[PDB]
């Protein structure tokens, strides 16, 4: 999981990782070798000035070692970039493939934006931090080990200086610690003291209505005077703290610089000190690198842990697991907030080859009741029958792809061209079938005016009209010739002529197949066969329009309100 899956998916790059490790070791070794050589060169130059024959050979040796260093670092970090990039691409592909299998509960429980952000940016940052750690931590640890070993072989004074160096680094970072403490304390004091202005401006209508602005002024002044006092003591305390930090820090610097040399004096090389004074900068930089890299590691491990936790799950319902359809005592509620119940013992049947509609001002979840047949959510109770067989035993993929077609009140378009976008239900689509379907759904006529035509991309491409988008949805819906059709508010917000055209297209398309339509305007339903009036969860009424007028139930009130 957090480690086993990562190790399994990182296994096929072990050889390249080892080669990179070797290159890093070489680069760190040469980087360790450089500063001592530079110190010796500057020391011999200074001694020659005090009194360049021997400097040329040392300079050439430094140049050769440094060219080797450049080649080694180039090879290392190009290999590291290759490995990290390959790992990132593989992880992105695997995460997308595994996440695409989940049901709707995961999707509507969370948000799409955060999922996309985690899928792309979080894993990119994880890979970046991971390879940066691989480089820097190994390089710096090997640098520290090599320089310490060389200085010890060069005695105990070097070990004492190395031990003292971490204390000096901490004393130096104490300034930044004081800075963050100052910032945090100031922010906390500001948050605690303020709020009166926020409360006053939050409800400005009332404060303007009742006519005073003076009481707020002295209250705000008193609050700011209190925050003012607290600020004086906080600043004074921070001042004393930083002053003590500085005094102690440089007192320790001077004391060490004196005592260590005085004690080590009790016979080393004259130029040994000059060569020793340069490695301090390198070791200090290394410890700073470790200090920052600790935060890099913690952030990266947290990101990787959450990525791998959300990467591999178990689908709630398996995805790969010609007649009438009916319900029986089906009740259901949304998984989130089960207190809001939806279905009170809902029973309904669809005649095999007749038009069925449904209507209600709010219904009590008419759209979700129109759902639940595509196995979007399993029913809490009751049974659903289709062609004499239960939908549970039937494979959901077969029912999705060869039985039920779905039209929403908003169509969806992708960057793929229209010719392939229509070929979306089956990828085995031939040539002439696409044009025939487009002609049947009234899409070939207007697509001619487009300059590119069937090669036009979408959001980043040419924009199509709402009626054109509705026409585009219909051809894809009819490619499979579904036995059951579902329409959700086909008569959306658009003009009258295009609405009539698309209604006629649906009429000549919805022939010989059972189709269920959901409409809000009652003027588009009188041409249907049967009408079901919904109110308060349970079914309110169902029957023919001509008898529904004589019934005088809730439908009479609804049509009176609409008229």
Ligand X SMILES: CC(C)CCC[C@@H](C)[C@H]1CC[C@H]2[C@@H]3CC=C4C[C@@H](O)CC[C@]4(C)[C@H]3CC[C@]12C
Binding-site positions read 360-367
Nearer to ligand ANP, 337 or 550 (CB): 337
**Residue 55 binding target from Mg ion, its own copies, ligand ANP, none, CB below 5 to 8 Å by type:** its own copies
CA distance 85 to 79: 10
The two three-digit tokens of residue 377, written as one number? 């959510």
The smaller minimum CB distance to its own copies, of residues 232 and 497, is found at: 232
Question: Which pair of structure tokens corresponds to residue 102?
Answer: 């989940």
* The one segment of 78-86, 223-231, 250-258, 366-374 that binds ligand ANP by CB under 6 A: 366-374
Tokens of 34: 């450089």
Q: Is 537 helix (H, G, I), strand (E, B) or coil?
A: coil
For residue 332, the minimal CB distance to its own copies (Å) is 17
Distance of CA 307 to the CA centre of its chain: 10
Can you tell me which of 35, 304, 365, 537 binds ligand ANP, judged by CB under 6 A? 365
Q: How far is CA 484 from CA 435, 512, 513, 534, in A?
A: 23, 10, 6, 21
- Asked if 346 touches ligand ANP (CB under 6 A), the answer is no
DSSP character for 359?
B
Shortest distance, position 25 Cβ to ligand X, whole Å: 12
CB of 141 to ligand X, least distance (A): 13
The two three-digit tokens of residue 371, written as one number? 């759902």
Pair 220, 175: CB distance under 8 Å: no
Q: Are 435 and 444 in contact (CB under 8 A)?
A: yes
- Are 455 and 417 in contact by the 8 Å Cβ rule? The answer is yes
Which residues, in sequence order, are bridge partners of residue 531? Answer: 543
Please report whether residue 362 would count as binding ligand ANP according to CB under 6 A: yes
CB 171 within 8 A of CB 248: yes
User: CB under 6 A: which stretch of 45-53, 193-201, 251-259, 359-367 binds ligand ANP?
Assistant: 359-367
55 is an interface residue for Mg ion by CB under 5 A: no
Closest to ligand ANP by CB, 336 vs 427, is 336
170 touches, from its own copies, ligand ANP, ligand X, none (C-beta below 5 to 8 Å by class): none
518 forms beta bridges with 358, 488
Assess 463 for contact with ligand ANP (CB under 6 A): no
Inter-axis angle of helices 14-50 and 272-311, nearest 10: 160
**Which of the ranges 26-34, 110-118, 258-266, 360-368 carries the binding residues for ligand ANP, by CB under 6 A?**
360-368
**Smallest separation, CB 333 to ligand ANP (Å):** 9
Between 153 and 336, CB nearer to ligand ANP: 336
Q: What residue 250 binds from Mg ion, its own copies, ligand ANP, none (CB within 5 to 8 A, per partner kind)?
A: its own copies
Q: Which residue from 260, 251, 193 is spatially nearest to 225, judged by alpha carbons?
A: 193
Q: Of these partners, ligand X, its own copies, Mg ion, none, which one is at the site of residue 476 (CB under 5 to 8 Å by kind)?
A: its own copies
- Give the interface segment with Mg ion, choosing from 96-104, 132-140, 367-375, 390-398 (CB under 5 A): 367-375
Answer for which of 54, 85, 108, 188 binds ligand ANP (CB under 6 A) is: 108
User: Pick from Mg ion, ligand X, ligand ANP, none: which does 168 bind, CB < 5 to 8 A by kind?
Assistant: ligand X
Rounded (10°) CA dihedral 278, 78, 303, 141 = -30
Q: Closer to ligand X at the Cβ: 124 or 280? A: 280
CA dihedral 21, 23, 27, 29 (to 10 degrees): 70
CB of 67 to ligand X, least distance (A): 14
Binding partner of residue 172 among ligand X, Mg ion, ligand ANP, none, CB under 5 to 8 Å per kind?
ligand X
482's torsion region: left (phi>0), alpha (psi -120 to 50) or beta? beta
Position 367 contacts ligand ANP (CB under 6 A): yes
Number of residues that bind Mg ion (CB under 5 A): 1
Q: How far is the CB of 537 from ligand ANP (least distance, A)?
A: 10
Residue 106 touches ligand ANP, criterion: CB under 6 A: no
User: Using CB atoms, what's the residue nearest to Mg ion?
Assistant: 367
Known binding residues for ATP are: 360-367
Cβ pair 197, 221 in contact under 8 A: no
Asked if 537 interacts with ligand ANP (CB under 6 A), we say no
Q: By CB under 6 A, tell whether 436 contacts ligand ANP.
A: no
How many amino acids of this chain bind ligand ANP (CB under 6 A)?
A: 9
22 or 381: CB nearest its own copies = 22
The beta-strand segments (E) located in 403-513 are: 404-407, 484-488
Distance CA 27, CA 139 (A): 8
Minimum gap (Å) between residue 344 Cβ and its own copies: 25
CA dihedral 415, 419, 423, 424 (to 10 degrees): 10
Give the strand order in the sheet containing 355-358.
404-407, 484-488, 514-518, 355-358, 530-534, 539-544
User: Measuring CA to CA, how many Å separate 35 from each of 146, 147, 278, 555?
Assistant: 12, 9, 6, 92
Closest to ligand ANP by CB, 26 vs 365, is: 365
Closest-CA residue to 119 (of 104, 102, 97, 103): 97
To ligand X, the closest distance from the beta carbon of 256 in angstroms equals 5
d(Cα 451, Cα 517) in Å, to the nearest integer? Answer: 35
- Which one of the spans 255-263, 282-290, 363-371, 381-389 is the region binding Mg ion (CB under 5 A)? 363-371
Distance between CA atoms of residues 469 and 463, nearest Å: 9
| One-character DSSP codes across 8-69 | HHHGGGHHHHHHHHHHHHHHHHHHHHHHHHHHHHHHHHHHHHH--TTHHHHHHHHHHHHHHH
Question: For ligand ANP, which stretch binds (CB under 6 A), given 67-75, 299-307, 364-372, 536-544?
Answer: 364-372
Q: Which residues bind ligand X (CB under 6 A)?
A: 31, 73, 139, 157, 161, 165, 168, 172, 175, 256-257, 260-261, 264, 273, 276-277, 280, 284-285
Least separation in angstroms between CB 413 and its own copies: 9
CB closer to its own copies out of 82 and 520:
82
Give whichever of 62 and 104 is closer to ligand X, judged by the CB atom: 62
Q: Which is nearer to Mg ion, 173 or 367 (CB)?
A: 367
Footprint on this chain of Mg ion (rule: CB under 5 A): 367
């Amino acid at each position: 999981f957090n480690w086993k899956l990562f190790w399994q998916f990182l296994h096929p790059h072990l050889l390249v990782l080892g080669v990179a490790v070797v290159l890093a070791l070489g680069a760190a070794l040469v980087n360790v070798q450089i500063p001592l050589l530079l110190g010796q060169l500057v020391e011999v130059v200074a001694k020659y000035t005090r009194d360049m024959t021997e400097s040329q050979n040392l300079s050439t040796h430094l140049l050769i070692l440094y060219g080797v260093q450049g080649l080694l670092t180039f090879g290392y970090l190009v290999l590291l970039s290759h490995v990290g990039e390959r790992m990132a691409v593989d992880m992105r592909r695997a995460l997308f493939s595994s996440l695409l299998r989940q049901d709707i509960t995961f999707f509507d429980a969370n948000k799409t934006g955060q999922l996309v952000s985690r899928l792309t940016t979080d894993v990119q940052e994880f890979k970046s931090s991971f390879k940066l750690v691989i480089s820097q931590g190994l390089r710096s640890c090997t640098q520290v080990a090599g320089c310490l070993v060389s200085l010890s072989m060069l005695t105990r004074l070097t070990l004492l200086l190395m031990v003292a160096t971490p204390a000096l680094m901490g004393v130096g970072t104490l300034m930044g610690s004081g800075l963050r403490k100052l910032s945090r304390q100031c922010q906390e004091q500001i948050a605690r003291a303020m709020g009166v202005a926020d409360e006053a401006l939050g409800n400005v209508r009332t404060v303007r209505a009742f006519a005073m602005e003076q009481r707020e002024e002295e209250r705000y002044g008193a609050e700011l005077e209190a925050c003012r006092c607290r600020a004086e003591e906080l600043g004074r305390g921070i001042a004393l703290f930083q002053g003590l930090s500085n005094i102690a820090f440089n007192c320790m610097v001077l004391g060490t610089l004196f005592i260590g040399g005085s004690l080590v004096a009790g016979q080393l090389t004259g130029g040994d000190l000059m060569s020793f004074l340069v490695a301090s900068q390198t070791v200090q930089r290394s410890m700073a690198n470790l200090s920052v890299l600790f935060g890099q590691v913690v952030r990266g491990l947290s990101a990787g842990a959450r990525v791998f936790e959300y990467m591999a799950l178990n689908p709630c319902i398996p995805l790969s697991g010609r007649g009438s359809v009916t319900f029986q005592n089906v009740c259901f509620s949304y998984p989130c907030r089960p207190g809001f119940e939806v279905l009170k013992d809902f029973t309904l049947t669809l005649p095999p080859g007749k038009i069925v509609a449904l209507v209600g001002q709010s219904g009590g979840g008419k759209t979700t009741v129109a759902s639940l047949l595509e196995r979007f959510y399993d029913p809490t109770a009751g049974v659903v029958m289709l062609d004499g067989r239960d939908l549970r035993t039937l494979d959901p993929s077969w029912l999705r792809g060869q039985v039920v077609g779905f039209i929403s009140q908003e169509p969806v378009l992708f960057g793929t061209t229209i010719m392939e976008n229509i070929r979306f239900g089956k990828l085995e689509a031939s040539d002439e079938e696409v044009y025939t379907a487009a002609r049947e759904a009234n899409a070939h006529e207007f697509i001619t005016s487009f300059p590119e035509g069937y090669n036009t991309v979408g959001e980043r491409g040419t924009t199509l009209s709402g009626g054109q988008k509705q026409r585009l949805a219909i051809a894809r819906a009819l490619i499979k010739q579904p036995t059951v059709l579902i329409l959700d508010e086909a008569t959306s917000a658009l003009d009258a002529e295009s609405e009539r055209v698309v209604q006629e297209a649906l009429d000549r398309a919805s022939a010989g197949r059972t189709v269920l339509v959901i409409a809000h305007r009652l003027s588009t339903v009188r041409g249907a066969h049967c009408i079901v009036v919904m109110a308060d969860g349970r079914v309110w009424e169902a029957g023919t329009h001509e008898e529904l007028l004589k019934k005088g139930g809730l439908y009479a009130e609804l049509i009176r309100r609409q008229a």
